[PDB]
Amino acid sequence: SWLTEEDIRRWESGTFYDSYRKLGAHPDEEGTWFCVWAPHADAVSVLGAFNNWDPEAHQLERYGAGLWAGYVPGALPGHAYKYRIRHGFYQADKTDPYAFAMEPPTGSLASIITRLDYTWHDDAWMQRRKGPASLYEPVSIYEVHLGSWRHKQPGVSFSYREIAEPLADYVQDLGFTHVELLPIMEHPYYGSWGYQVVGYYAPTFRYGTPQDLMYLIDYLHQRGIGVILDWVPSHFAADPQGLVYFDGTTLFEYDDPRMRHHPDWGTYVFDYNKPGVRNFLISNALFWLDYYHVDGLRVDAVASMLYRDGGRENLEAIDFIKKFNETVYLHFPEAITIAEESTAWPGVSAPTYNNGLGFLYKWNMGWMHDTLDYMRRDPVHRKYHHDTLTFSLWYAFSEHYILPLSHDEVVHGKGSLWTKMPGDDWQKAANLRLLYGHMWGHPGKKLLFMGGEFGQHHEWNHDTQLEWHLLDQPYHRGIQAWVRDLNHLYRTHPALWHDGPEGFEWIDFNDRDQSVICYLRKHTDRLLLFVLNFTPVPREHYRVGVPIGGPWREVLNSDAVAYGGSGMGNFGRVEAVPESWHGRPFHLELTLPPLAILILEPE
Amino acid sequence: LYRDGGRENLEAIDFIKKFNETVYLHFPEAITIAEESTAWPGVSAPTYNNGLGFLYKWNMGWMHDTLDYMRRDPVHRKYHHDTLTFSLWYAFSEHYILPLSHDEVVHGKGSLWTKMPGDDWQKAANLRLLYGHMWGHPGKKLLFMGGEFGQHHEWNHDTQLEWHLLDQPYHRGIQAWVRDLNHLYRTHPALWHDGPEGFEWIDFNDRDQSVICYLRKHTDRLLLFVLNFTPVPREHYRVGVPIGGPWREVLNSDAVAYGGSGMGNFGRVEAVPESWHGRPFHLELTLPPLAILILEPES
Amino acid sequence: SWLTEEDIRRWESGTFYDSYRKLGAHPDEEGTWFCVWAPHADAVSVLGAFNNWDPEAHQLERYGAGLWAGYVPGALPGHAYKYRIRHGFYQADKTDPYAFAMEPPTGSPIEGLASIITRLDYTWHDDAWMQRRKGPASLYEPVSIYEVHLGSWRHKQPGVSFSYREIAEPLADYVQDLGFTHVELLPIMEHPYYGSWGYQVVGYYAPTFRYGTPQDLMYLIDYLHQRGIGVILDWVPSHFAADPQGLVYFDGTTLFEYDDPRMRHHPDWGTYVFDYNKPGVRNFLISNALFWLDYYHVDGLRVDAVASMLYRENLEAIDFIKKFNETVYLHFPEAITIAEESTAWPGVSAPTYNNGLGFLYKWNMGWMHDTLDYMRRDPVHRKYHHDTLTFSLWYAFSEHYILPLSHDEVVHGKGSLWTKMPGDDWQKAANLRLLYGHMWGHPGKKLLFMGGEFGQHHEWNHDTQLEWHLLDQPYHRGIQAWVRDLNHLYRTHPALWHDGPEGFEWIDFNDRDQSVICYLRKHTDRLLLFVLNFTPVPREHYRVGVPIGGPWREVLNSDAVAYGGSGMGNFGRVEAVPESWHGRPFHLELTLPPLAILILEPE
Secondary structure: OOOOHHHHHHHHHOOOOOHHHHOEEEEOOOEEEEEEEOOOOOEEEEEEHHHOOOOOOOEEEEOOOOEEEEEEEOOOOOOEEEEEEEEOOEEEEEOOOOOOOEEOOOOOOEEEOOOOOOOOOOHHHHHHOOHHHHHHOOOEEEEEOHHHHOEEEOOEEOOHHHHHHHHHHHHHHOOOOEEEEOOOEEOOOHHHOOOOOOEEEEEOHHHOOHHHHHHHHHHHHHOOOEEEEEEOOOEOOOOOOOOOOOOOOOOOOOOOHHHHOOOOOOOOEOOOOOHHHHHHHHHHHHHHHHHOOOOEEEEOOHHHHHEOOOOOEOHHHHHHHHHHHHHHHHHOOOOEEEEOOOOOOOOOOOOHHHOOOOOOEEEOHHHHHHHHHHHHOOHHHHOOOHHHHHHHHHHOOOOOEEEEEOOHHHOOOOOOHHHHOOOOHHHHHHHHHHHHHHHHHOOOEEEEEOOOOOOOOOOOOOOOOOOOHHHHOHHHHHHHHHHHHHHHHHHHOHHHOOOOHHHEEEEEEEEOOOOEEEEEEEEOOEEEEEEEEOOOOOEEEEEEEEOOOOEEEEEEEOOOHHHOOOOOOOOOOEEOEOOOEOOEOEEEEEEEOOOOEEEEEEO | OEOOOOOEOHHHHHHHHHHHHHHHHHOOOOOOEEOOOOOOOOOOOOHHHOOOOOOEEEOHHHHHHHHHHHHOOHHHHHHHHHHHHHHHHHOOOOOEEEEEOHHHHOOOOOOHHHHOOOOHHHHHHHHHHHHHHHHHOOOEEEEOOOOOOOOOOOOOOOOOOOHHHHHOHHHHHHHHHHHHHHHHHHHOHHHOOOOHHHEEEEEEEEOOOOEEEEEEEEOOEEEEEEEEOOOOOEEEEEEEEOOOOEEEEEEEOOOHHHOOOOOOOOOOEEOEOOOEOOEOEEEEEEEOOOEEEEEEEOO | OOOOHHHHHHHHHOOOOOHHHOOEEEEOOOEEEEEEEOOOOOEEEEEEHHHOOOOOOOEOEEOOOOEEEEEEEOOOOOOEEEEEEEEOOEEEEEOOOOOOOEEOOOOOOOOOOEEEOOOOOOOOOOHHHHHHOOOHHHHHOOOEEEEEOHHHHOEEEOOEEOOHHHHHHHHHHHHHHHOOOEEEEOOOEEOOOHHHOOOOOOEEEEEOHHHOOHHHHHHHHHHHHHOOOEEEEEEOOOEOOOOOOOOOOOOOOOOOOOOOOHHHOOOOOOOOEOOOOOHHHHHHHHHHHHHHHHHOOOOEEEEOOHHHHHOOOOHHHHHHHHHHHHHHHHHOOOOEEEEOOOOOOOOOOOOHHHOOOOOOEEEOHHHHHHHHHHHHOOHHHHHHHHHHHHHHHHOOOOOOEEEEEOHHHHOOOOOOHHHHOOOOHHHHHHHHHHHHHHHHHOOOEEEEEOOOOOOOOOOOOOOOOOOHHHHHOHHHHHHHHHHHHHHHHHHHOHHHOOOOHHHEEEEEOOOOOOOEEEEEEEEOOEEEEEEEEOOOOOEEEEEEEEOOOOEEEEEEEOOOHHHOOOOOOOOOEEEOEOOOEOOEOEEEEEEEOOOOEEEEEEO
16 A cells, blocks of 8 residues: 555545645655556556556556556656556556656656655744734735746756845845745746646756755745745646546546636636545645745636636635635645735635635735826826826725736736836836835735836846846836835835725825825824825925924935936925824925925934 | 716716715714715715715615525525625625615516515515515615515505505514514614624525524624525524523514514523534524524523 | 659648548558548557557558558458557557547447448439439528437437438438428537537547448438438538547647647637648548538538637638638539528628628528517517517528527527417417418528427437427427428428518518518519418408409418417408508408418419
């Protein structure tokens, strides 16, 4: 026995979330054990150099629940293999779904017997990770495709170990708390960015071995940065050598023909009704959280799982999503789960016991759409569209949200964030500085995709690296400085940490003509005041009500020339005039620079 | 609000706000309620929060969904369980008044009674069940004329309500059920607070048997709601509870006084200290057909 | 060798429309030739009992155009075979796309279908039929199609269908008794899932094993021809079946499916659409159309879900469709092509040189939807939807249409045709006869699916035989008798043969309250008058204008007792009255029976 009679009983239930240890390829000192799930197969064999690639020499023997196991003496680490499964008349060669390492034979993929031995250097980090408590702390996420970020030479990506020290510094210099990694799991078409997955249990070869990635996380953890992984339980890759019709029949697929056709992915969706699929998917969740200590998982296209598009909603997926999150937090109390759901499915970020999906965070795609839609327009146009801006807060507390500017918004002709912004180059730079300033002020956590911080003109290209030649140009350097300052203010002031309705107060929302909004962020005693000038006309003697009187400080000036503005600043310690304005006992009479944001803190 | 620049009529939006501001200034204890079937936000919120300034909003979402679920035959209610349970994701967006009105009983939409499926006893049971849920659900209560007897025809203004129906048992019974429902509402402060603190889920996944349990609490006070939306009675049904000890059922929709089958829990229901639905103790109860059970711990 | 230089030249062009002459398995008395198209394969071999299923015994040789060929001595008819294709690291067993017969070696209900070496030799005796057969000219001849699922039609024993031979005599006898001109058979091409009804095809060149050998099917068609019945085949070029050894990823890469990742996503099928850009796909598909018309003497081909082909606009699909029809009628001038297109795509039934798709016929689904919708209503309410009935004539001449009642319309809870009609059993049968009466009177050819002719209660269940036991009851034998007499009228009276606008005249449409319709069907001197009462209330002294005066006879009355009706009618001769009505010189004063159609002829 490789497999306990109990382990099979757990498989029948779909309650083995440690299935990785039983399944896949496991080296011992004299050979390796192979274990594959192929219930509707008549025979399963492992073929490799260790047996001259002959099906007969090593054939796996079925145990309970369509689970095949066998030992091959002489099977060694670094060996390539493939499973040859026979479904009656026909035979086919397959990859190991639980392969912990895949390397292409061409060098342009074959499962490799691998050992995941690694000794960690992040003990200190894990003890301090916030998880659910992170809701009351700042999260500022830097989204990255490792291949696109930095290059050694054109068309040559950075390795896992190599990128760590350059990336960790850049992330630290800007004060981000976490990096969200576009899917690292093995995928054939690099142009997919990782979203069509073949090796759910294998990190991509292009950046190194499993150990190379483990260290990258080790380093990022030691340097105080969190790592969030993008996860694709919604669908599986099209290529046949992979998961498609694995046992010769539908396996990860829906057995029934009606359910299998689906929008976006057809016959490539996971059958969450099957217990084996749930084992496979939920085990992978912990596998990444366990063997690689990942801090978070971000689930994309949650709407595609929830709906089928009798009940239109897919309950199998809905309970799977709920039990996925339930398992994560029971096994890892400080893990972090994020969902992107482009529907108003309620309680995505809500606990399962309240009928929620159980994520900690939901991408605020409403905010993103509204915000981008508002600022795409001309400032003269903005006064008509001003309500779009202010009404963002009517939806800002429905869920635990992360305000998100993502890679997808910077592709497919939508234009770089820079490109979207209106006017001349100075006004465009101001508008992006205003955008990010307002985004850090808006309640909710923050995520920015690569290149937004230096305002790169080009749309994100995976075959290229971001335009660092722009870091030299002044406006781009100023936008980088502005983002770093906002993160520093975010890291320090607790008023921005509490994204609850308690944490936000409106000061003024009705300057519809000059497109100005004043609002407040409070936690307990501490206060921060936000004045946003969304039109290029500067305003002097503009009065803004305040709760508290006394000396007020200008904590940040979007137009401070250090960011590339006209340099127009109050440049003074403001004193609250005890004459009421905006229904407040006091008011500040301030100067609003063009397309600029002032953040004011009491002294 | 909408004429359909933008679609919004800001004239009207400022008029509505200045309307509410003026009323509450001159009459601080007046009440303004709005019916808005768009999802315009913060209708019940103060103007200084960018709201329209009404104190109350009719919960048209609750009614449409709730009515749609009640109309479906109980055999099918299995498949629309998410419709009933999901109403509470929206029950706290505004200060809400759950409303059943003349508009729902006109122009061929049918009497509330007519809206209910099944045989005659079942129509009264379903109609009694709905009102139980309307009172248990968070939010204030509004019911239009004739629904309290469960009158048969749509509201006809050129004529009188069907008062003769008050002699038949099923209809005098729904009137009795509403009377006691209002009495429970008036006396128990657990129902006065329509905020999220005032509501707790007990269990929502009995989707095959179409059973729903929720709690309405203010401080010490608790009220337990168990709803059987199928004509099958359920026996030895366990329902988690926060506190143990003696519990009594203060209301049973299926009581004979209302025209019901007469099953229920007569004797003291004592909590069993075994965890259920993630709760420390549990009650093993009998759920009557198409009935709502309201339970209070004993003091 | 096996492939001449001309054969490879045509295949590269996309012009090899007889490709079965060379592709697939071709037996010789000593051995069998094998030829399979797999351009992206590094190795391909034939496996069979004839070589101990050893892959290295017979590796086919790469010729040009990605074509592989090889000869195997000792491979004989009835031997089972499989292709073993190696795509770099991975190998897979695949079926022959050009298989001339497939069989489950297992005999099991769920089983792999294995390609079997087959000889297609057969001597035909359908001389008279094919020399007098008329395709495109059938536009001016009566076409009445009986749509059939061979397994579902009649059972020889419970759960056992009839052979191609065993069904031959019973089916021909039944169709002749009811007077249909053609039978349309749901796809007989080899399909894995019996529940697919044949629309998921694996062996396009192989008749399904369930009903016998190829020669059995050729015999069935031969027999039907001698009996004077035409055979229309359902053909599925829109999509192929998802089976792992089938056409999916044939050479290890995309072959029959679109190479591009994006234009693979398809709402109806996706991933399994044919890439009409490829000359090889065009070869495979267009040859198959000709293959059935040639080797199986088929009279017609009906393509379903054409809307799934035209849109993704797919110019390549449309040019495929156009070159399909052009090529068909080029090789078989008396063939028939029918299309069902669920969009209002114009000119389906139009010739290619007029910018049409080139089919001879289009299914009139507009007619089907409206009529059923109108008759689903109770006679009390039909008063308010009168335009739904009459307005069908605004659309009756846009194409050469076949009014269609199909299996699609009597399954998946849509209800049997009997079930669809309102009222008590007498009224449902009365209404069904009226619907059949109107469908035969309305312009266009006629199609009726099995079980509608007796008005079967239950929805069509493919696992069972039609409820023939219902033929004992009076209503059901009557509806069947009514259909027979309608078909007798159709075949003899040429007024119904011309579905052109010349062939139809309105007599009255404004009787909305009483829900009555009078329309006229004419060819030259010949006339047919139609009076329809869609309410169970009979109307007496109803005047109906007529073009010609004089004696009129009532040739058919749906309400005759022989059909299961009340027995009201206009006894024998009717004499036109020289007083004007409906803008006509004469009129007949008639008695209109309940829910009945009268068909009247001048004497």
